[PDB]
Amino acid sequence: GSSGFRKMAFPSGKVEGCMVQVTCGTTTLNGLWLDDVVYCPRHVICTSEDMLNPNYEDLLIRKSNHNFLVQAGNVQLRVIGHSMQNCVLKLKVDTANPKTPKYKFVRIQPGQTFSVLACYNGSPSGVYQCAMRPNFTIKGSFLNGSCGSVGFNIDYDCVSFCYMHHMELPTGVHAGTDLEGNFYGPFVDRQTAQAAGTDTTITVNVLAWLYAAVINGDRWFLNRFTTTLNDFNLVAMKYNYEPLTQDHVDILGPLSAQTGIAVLDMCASLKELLQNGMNGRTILGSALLEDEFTPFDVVRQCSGVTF
Amino acid sequence: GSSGFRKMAFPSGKVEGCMVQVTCGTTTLNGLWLDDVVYCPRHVICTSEDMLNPNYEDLLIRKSNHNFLVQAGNVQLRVIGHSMQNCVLKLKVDTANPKTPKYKFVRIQPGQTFSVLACYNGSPSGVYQCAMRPNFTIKGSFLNGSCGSVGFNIDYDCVSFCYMHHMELPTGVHAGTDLEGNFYGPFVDRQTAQAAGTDTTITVNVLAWLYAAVINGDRWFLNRFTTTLNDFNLVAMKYNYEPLTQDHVDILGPLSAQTGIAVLDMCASLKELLQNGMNGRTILGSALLEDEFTPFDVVRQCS
């Protein structure tokens, strides 16, 4: 009686049509072409020596428009101006992208998810979902050449770009900026020592995923008990889970509504899973508790929202 | 010193440009518009009652071209012919799709992976990777209205279509056809009792995933032993793993080349993981041995 539930990326076509390559000197990375501007990481202008201690304002003014080779597929775009907004370069080009989607630049919050279109040399290679971790990193898959790849959501009729890729930390997690060029987290676009802080599990998302399991007929873990927010948080603190807040209880409301299971009842089921384990069983195919689905991700998938 | 490894779908844009909606009476599903043909499940011509016991030849003789409403966006495409090939309907339309990519129709093998573009009313909802299981089902996410959604691989700019969605079995797994209309597995396009058969674990894929862990710097499980092919298969059989053959050993060759770790050495590490378990440790973020990545999936990601 169960039904499937998968980590599902947004369809990527609207974003694929915006990916270009930007080459400055010997460095090539990806850019995002919206109307008559290409957005890309400003470190395209740096040599390996520059990256050790970059003076970005000085390095940018030393570049000419001709120093930027921008290619959309096999068509060379001509740069007519270059400016900087925080860590993002804006290259004004003399032609407008005819496939520009309705778009917004948004800054997401920790715990929220987005789709990544991983690209190399301006060409898309794959698509997958990520969550902004509480420590402001993402668990992605990015090789050399992926800088400038973007993360996005599709919100009704609009592509909301929220992430542009910049770096891989020594623990194999990833960091980047919003499309205004401001890093998520305390990271900087230079080759200086930086490390991911300690991470925690996104409790509200684990609860949303447990609701997804119930909605999809995989409900072996439900118990007959209920708890309070404070009592649940006493347990959350012992297992490196984020404290559950009232705002989180509120955003779980729609899933509580559809199942008839109150949030604090599901908290009691989660408490038993943390304290006693998974009993040699899976939930939606997983042997661990999944924390990279938001409540809205569950609603979107269970309702078949299209774009 | 590790690096990331993710289940990664192909970019969906080339396929999105081919998705249309097909409506016959009150039944609406998805179709695939390539050149001047729309491919869709033949059960678009069935009512709910027809589905209990359809005779498709007789149901199709009763249809006109007009009975098929095809919409690409909200642009109606005029149907100028209709023909059946196994469980697929082919609707000739008066316009060739200007967005037709270079494409092939391929019949994939159990253990091979592909990306699914889940669609409703001819519009895309999301994209994810699936493996064809040894029992010829896939573990997807498909709601009512998803039928005709397709699975595909992209090799450079050539789209190989390999799956068209038809059904959800009572255990929440999914079945469908290739693009020539032949079901994978023993399933039939009728609302009659059918169930997924016993499955097994895709051994060659588990090994590829362990190579992926090594390549990406998550290698705690690697031992310094080796085994023979037959000794490995004797152990893995007890864990419901498919037999590993020399053909599978050869396909793991690129990963053995890049790591310098022989396939039979990896088999010895997998043997130990089957005997002892993980003991609270994870590999690439997982507490289970993952079997839905092929050797080429690993090479495609790490290159």
PDB file of all heavy atoms in Angstrom, chain A residues 193-211:
ATOM      1  N   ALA A 193      43.120  29.725   4.893  1.00  0.00           N
ATOM      2  CA  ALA A 193      42.627  28.595   5.669  1.00  0.00           C
ATOM      3  C   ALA A 193      41.194  28.850   6.122  1.00  0.00           C
ATOM      4  O   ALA A 193      40.919  29.813   6.842  1.00  0.00           O
ATOM      5  CB  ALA A 193      43.539  28.350   6.869  1.00  0.00           C
ATOM      6  N   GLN A 194      40.274  28.001   5.674  1.00  0.00           N
ATOM      7  CA  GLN A 194      38.907  28.057   6.163  1.00  0.00           C
ATOM      8  C   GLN A 194      38.368  26.641   6.244  1.00  0.00           C
ATOM      9  O   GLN A 194      38.784  25.752   5.492  1.00  0.00           O
ATOM     10  CB  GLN A 194      37.997  29.005   5.368  1.00  0.00           C
ATOM     11  CG  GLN A 194      38.236  29.044   3.892  1.00  0.00           C
ATOM     12  CD  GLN A 194      37.794  30.353   3.241  1.00  0.00           C
ATOM     13  OE1 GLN A 194      36.761  30.935   3.592  1.00  0.00           O
ATOM     14  NE2 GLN A 194      38.571  30.809   2.275  1.00  0.00           N
ATOM     15  N   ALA A 195      37.486  26.437   7.214  1.00  0.00           N
ATOM     16  CA  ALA A 195      36.990  25.114   7.533  1.00  0.00           C
ATOM     17  C   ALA A 195      35.513  25.219   7.856  1.00  0.00           C
ATOM     18  O   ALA A 195      35.048  26.245   8.356  1.00  0.00           O
ATOM     19  CB  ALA A 195      37.713  24.531   8.757  1.00  0.00           C
ATOM     20  N   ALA A 196      34.787  24.144   7.557  1.00  0.00           N
ATOM     21  CA  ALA A 196      33.386  24.047   7.940  1.00  0.00           C
ATOM     22  C   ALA A 196      33.283  23.949   9.457  1.00  0.00           C
ATOM     23  O   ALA A 196      34.047  23.213  10.092  1.00  0.00           O
ATOM     24  CB  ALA A 196      32.778  22.792   7.311  1.00  0.00           C
ATOM     25  N   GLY A 197      32.360  24.708  10.041  1.00  0.00           N
ATOM     26  CA  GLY A 197      32.039  24.552  11.447  1.00  0.00           C
ATOM     27  C   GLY A 197      31.320  23.235  11.694  1.00  0.00           C
ATOM     28  O   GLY A 197      31.020  22.470  10.778  1.00  0.00           O
ATOM     29  N   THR A 198      31.060  22.953  12.971  1.00  0.00           N
ATOM     30  CA  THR A 198      30.319  21.745  13.304  1.00  0.00           C
ATOM     31  C   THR A 198      28.884  21.867  12.805  1.00  0.00           C
ATOM     32  O   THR A 198      28.252  22.921  12.913  1.00  0.00           O
ATOM     33  CB  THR A 198      30.338  21.487  14.813  1.00  0.00           C
ATOM     34  OG1 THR A 198      29.843  22.641  15.504  1.00  0.00           O
ATOM     35  CG2 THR A 198      31.758  21.180  15.294  1.00  0.00           C
ATOM     36  N   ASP A 199      28.386  20.792  12.232  1.00  0.00           N
ATOM     37  CA  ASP A 199      27.042  20.791  11.685  1.00  0.00           C
ATOM     38  C   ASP A 199      26.085  20.114  12.652  1.00  0.00           C
ATOM     39  O   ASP A 199      26.488  19.449  13.605  1.00  0.00           O
ATOM     40  CB  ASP A 199      27.024  20.095  10.334  1.00  0.00           C
ATOM     41  CG  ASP A 199      25.883  20.566   9.455  1.00  0.00           C
ATOM     42  OD1 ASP A 199      25.362  21.699   9.651  1.00  0.00           O
ATOM     43  OD2 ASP A 199      25.515  19.782   8.576  1.00  0.00           O
ATOM     44  N   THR A 200      24.797  20.315  12.396  1.00  0.00           N
ATOM     45  CA  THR A 200      23.734  19.713  13.187  1.00  0.00           C
ATOM     46  C   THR A 200      22.669  19.209  12.225  1.00  0.00           C
ATOM     47  O   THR A 200      22.620  19.601  11.055  1.00  0.00           O
ATOM     48  CB  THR A 200      23.096  20.729  14.134  1.00  0.00           C
ATOM     49  OG1 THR A 200      22.719  21.902  13.399  1.00  0.00           O
ATOM     50  CG2 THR A 200      24.085  21.134  15.213  1.00  0.00           C
ATOM     51  N   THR A 201      21.804  18.341  12.733  1.00  0.00           N
ATOM     52  CA  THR A 201      20.726  17.776  11.928  1.00  0.00           C
ATOM     53  C   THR A 201      19.527  18.716  11.939  1.00  0.00           C
ATOM     54  O   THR A 201      19.158  19.272  12.982  1.00  0.00           O
ATOM     55  CB  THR A 201      20.341  16.406  12.487  1.00  0.00           C
ATOM     56  OG1 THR A 201      21.449  15.498  12.343  1.00  0.00           O
ATOM     57  CG2 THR A 201      19.132  15.838  11.752  1.00  0.00           C
ATOM     58  N   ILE A 202      18.920  18.899  10.760  1.00  0.00           N
ATOM     59  CA  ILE A 202      17.811  19.833  10.579  1.00  0.00           C
ATOM     60  C   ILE A 202      16.507  19.164  11.009  1.00  0.00           C
ATOM     61  O   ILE A 202      15.834  18.502  10.204  1.00  0.00           O
ATOM     62  CB  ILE A 202      17.728  20.322   9.121  1.00  0.00           C
ATOM     63  CG1 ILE A 202      19.084  20.878   8.647  1.00  0.00           C
ATOM     64  CG2 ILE A 202      16.634  21.365   8.987  1.00  0.00           C
ATOM     65  CD1 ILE A 202      19.244  20.829   7.133  1.00  0.00           C
ATOM     66  N   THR A 203      16.130  19.377  12.272  1.00  0.00           N
ATOM     67  CA  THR A 203      15.032  18.645  12.905  1.00  0.00           C
ATOM     68  C   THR A 203      13.718  18.811  12.148  1.00  0.00           C
ATOM     69  O   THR A 203      12.978  17.834  11.937  1.00  0.00           O
ATOM     70  CB  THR A 203      14.887  19.170  14.332  1.00  0.00           C
ATOM     71  OG1 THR A 203      16.168  19.115  14.972  1.00  0.00           O
ATOM     72  CG2 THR A 203      13.888  18.335  15.118  1.00  0.00           C
ATOM     73  N   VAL A 204      13.381  20.051  11.773  1.00  0.00           N
ATOM     74  CA  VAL A 204      12.111  20.289  11.090  1.00  0.00           C
ATOM     75  C   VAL A 204      12.020  19.480   9.804  1.00  0.00           C
ATOM     76  O   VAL A 204      10.936  18.988   9.443  1.00  0.00           O
ATOM     77  CB  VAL A 204      11.866  21.794  10.875  1.00  0.00           C
ATOM     78  CG1 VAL A 204      12.845  22.369   9.855  1.00  0.00           C
ATOM     79  CG2 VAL A 204      10.429  22.031  10.433  1.00  0.00           C
ATOM     80  N   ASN A 205      13.155  19.289   9.123  1.00  0.00           N
ATOM     81  CA  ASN A 205      13.157  18.517   7.890  1.00  0.00           C
ATOM     82  C   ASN A 205      13.026  17.026   8.168  1.00  0.00           C
ATOM     83  O   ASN A 205      12.367  16.315   7.397  1.00  0.00           O
ATOM     84  CB  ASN A 205      14.421  18.779   7.072  1.00  0.00           C
ATOM     85  CG  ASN A 205      14.459  20.158   6.463  1.00  0.00           C
ATOM     86  OD1 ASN A 205      13.548  20.972   6.624  1.00  0.00           O
ATOM     87  ND2 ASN A 205      15.553  20.437   5.763  1.00  0.00           N
ATOM     88  N   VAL A 206      13.649  16.529   9.247  1.00  0.00           N
ATOM     89  CA  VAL A 206      13.450  15.120   9.600  1.00  0.00           C
ATOM     90  C   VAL A 206      11.976  14.862   9.856  1.00  0.00           C
ATOM     91  O   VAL A 206      11.409  13.869   9.379  1.00  0.00           O
ATOM     92  CB  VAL A 206      14.300  14.720  10.816  1.00  0.00           C
ATOM     93  CG1 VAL A 206      13.959  13.289  11.276  1.00  0.00           C
ATOM     94  CG2 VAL A 206      15.777  14.855  10.493  1.00  0.00           C
ATOM     95  N   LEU A 207      11.323  15.766  10.595  1.00  0.00           N
ATOM     96  CA  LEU A 207       9.893  15.621  10.847  1.00  0.00           C
ATOM     97  C   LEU A 207       9.087  15.653   9.552  1.00  0.00           C
ATOM     98  O   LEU A 207       8.165  14.850   9.382  1.00  0.00           O
ATOM     99  CB  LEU A 207       9.427  16.683  11.841  1.00  0.00           C
ATOM    100  CG  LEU A 207       9.942  16.498  13.281  1.00  0.00           C
ATOM    101  CD1 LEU A 207       9.715  17.776  14.079  1.00  0.00           C
ATOM    102  CD2 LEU A 207       9.218  15.328  13.931  1.00  0.00           C
ATOM    103  N   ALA A 208       9.425  16.566   8.625  1.00  0.00           N
ATOM    104  CA  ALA A 208       8.709  16.608   7.346  1.00  0.00           C
ATOM    105  C   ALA A 208       8.848  15.287   6.600  1.00  0.00           C
ATOM    106  O   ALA A 208       7.892  14.801   5.985  1.00  0.00           O
ATOM    107  CB  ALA A 208       9.258  17.739   6.480  1.00  0.00           C
ATOM    108  N   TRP A 209      10.041  14.703   6.632  1.00  0.00           N
ATOM    109  CA  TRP A 209      10.276  13.436   5.950  1.00  0.00           C
ATOM    110  C   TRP A 209       9.521  12.292   6.622  1.00  0.00           C
ATOM    111  O   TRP A 209       9.037  11.375   5.945  1.00  0.00           O
ATOM    112  CB  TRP A 209      11.779  13.200   5.932  1.00  0.00           C
ATOM    113  CG  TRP A 209      12.261  11.887   5.415  1.00  0.00           C
ATOM    114  CD1 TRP A 209      12.337  11.482   4.106  1.00  0.00           C
ATOM    115  CD2 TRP A 209      12.787  10.824   6.201  1.00  0.00           C
ATOM    116  NE1 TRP A 209      12.882  10.225   4.045  1.00  0.00           N
ATOM    117  CE2 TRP A 209      13.156   9.792   5.314  1.00  0.00           C
ATOM    118  CE3 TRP A 209      12.970  10.638   7.572  1.00  0.00           C
ATOM    119  CZ2 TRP A 209      13.702   8.590   5.761  1.00  0.00           C
ATOM    120  CZ3 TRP A 209      13.513   9.441   8.015  1.00  0.00           C
ATOM    121  CH2 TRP A 209      13.874   8.440   7.114  1.00  0.00           C
ATOM    122  N   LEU A 210       9.399  12.321   7.950  1.00  0.00           N
ATOM    123  CA  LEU A 210       8.564  11.319   8.604  1.00  0.00           C
ATOM    124  C   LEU A 210       7.110  11.461   8.175  1.00  0.00           C
ATOM    125  O   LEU A 210       6.417  10.461   7.979  1.00  0.00           O
ATOM    126  CB  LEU A 210       8.714  11.397  10.130  1.00  0.00           C
ATOM    127  CG  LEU A 210      10.087  10.966  10.657  1.00  0.00           C
ATOM    128  CD1 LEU A 210      10.163  11.201  12.167  1.00  0.00           C
ATOM    129  CD2 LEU A 210      10.405   9.503  10.331  1.00  0.00           C
ATOM    130  N   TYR A 211       6.627  12.697   8.007  1.00  0.00           N
ATOM    131  CA  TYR A 211       5.281  12.882   7.476  1.00  0.00           C
ATOM    132  C   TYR A 211       5.185  12.364   6.045  1.00  0.00           C
ATOM    133  O   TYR A 211       4.166  11.763   5.668  1.00  0.00           O
ATOM    134  CB  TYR A 211       4.875  14.356   7.526  1.00  0.00           C
ATOM    135  CG  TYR A 211       4.298  14.813   8.842  1.00  0.00           C
ATOM    136  CD1 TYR A 211       5.028  15.645   9.666  1.00  0.00           C
ATOM    137  CD2 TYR A 211       3.032  14.407   9.269  1.00  0.00           C
ATOM    138  CE1 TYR A 211       4.516  16.094  10.880  1.00  0.00           C
ATOM    139  CE2 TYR A 211       2.516  14.850  10.494  1.00  0.00           C
ATOM    140  CZ  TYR A 211       3.273  15.693  11.287  1.00  0.00           C
ATOM    141  OH  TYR A 211       2.778  16.144  12.485  1.00  0.00           O
TER     142      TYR A 211
END
